[PDB]
Design a protein around this ligand. Structure first.
Ligand SMILES: [Mg+2]
Length: 62
DNA sequence: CCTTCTGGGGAATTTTAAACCGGCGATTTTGGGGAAAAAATAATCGGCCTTGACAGCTGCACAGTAAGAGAATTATGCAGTGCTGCCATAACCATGAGTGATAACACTGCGGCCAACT
């Protein structure tokens, strides 16, 4: 967590290689699963559609 | 002309079939304890499938509001000086109490002297 939140490392291979020296012996799946929430949420592509009521909304832009 | 046979009906009795209720023998069910197996849940493992990024980099422009940095100005608090009055302290004498001092013995610290090694 310190690595992710202060060094900005999100490479599962790098973190796995680091902690393996510390003593970890398991696989990378648990690491990826634990680290997934910290990763940034990629923007969606689905786009909701809305139909405003008559004489109820207007939009402005430059 | 008469006698005997037979048939119907009411009353008494007997037997067998049916239904209920109780008693007796058997299985079931509930509870607790111990063992074994199944399944559920969580964690860990390997690997496949798919796609994002890496391609010079990001600083600036405008919009509005607010903050702040520097300089000038103003307000105020401290300080300085003079004169007068009041309170504190200090100076002396007396008496009591505490501590520094003095005597004596014992233990320890420091300086002078002797010897051993390089
Ligand atoms: Mg716009």
């Amino acid at each position: 967590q310190k690595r992710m939140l202060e060094d900005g490392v999100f490479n599962s291979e790098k973190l796995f290689f680091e902690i393996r020296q510390q003593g970890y012996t398991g696989g990378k799946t648990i690491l990826k699963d634990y680290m997934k929430p910290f990763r940034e949420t990629a923007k969606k592509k689905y786009t909701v559609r809305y139909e405003t009521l008559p004489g109820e909304q207007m939009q402005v832009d430059w």
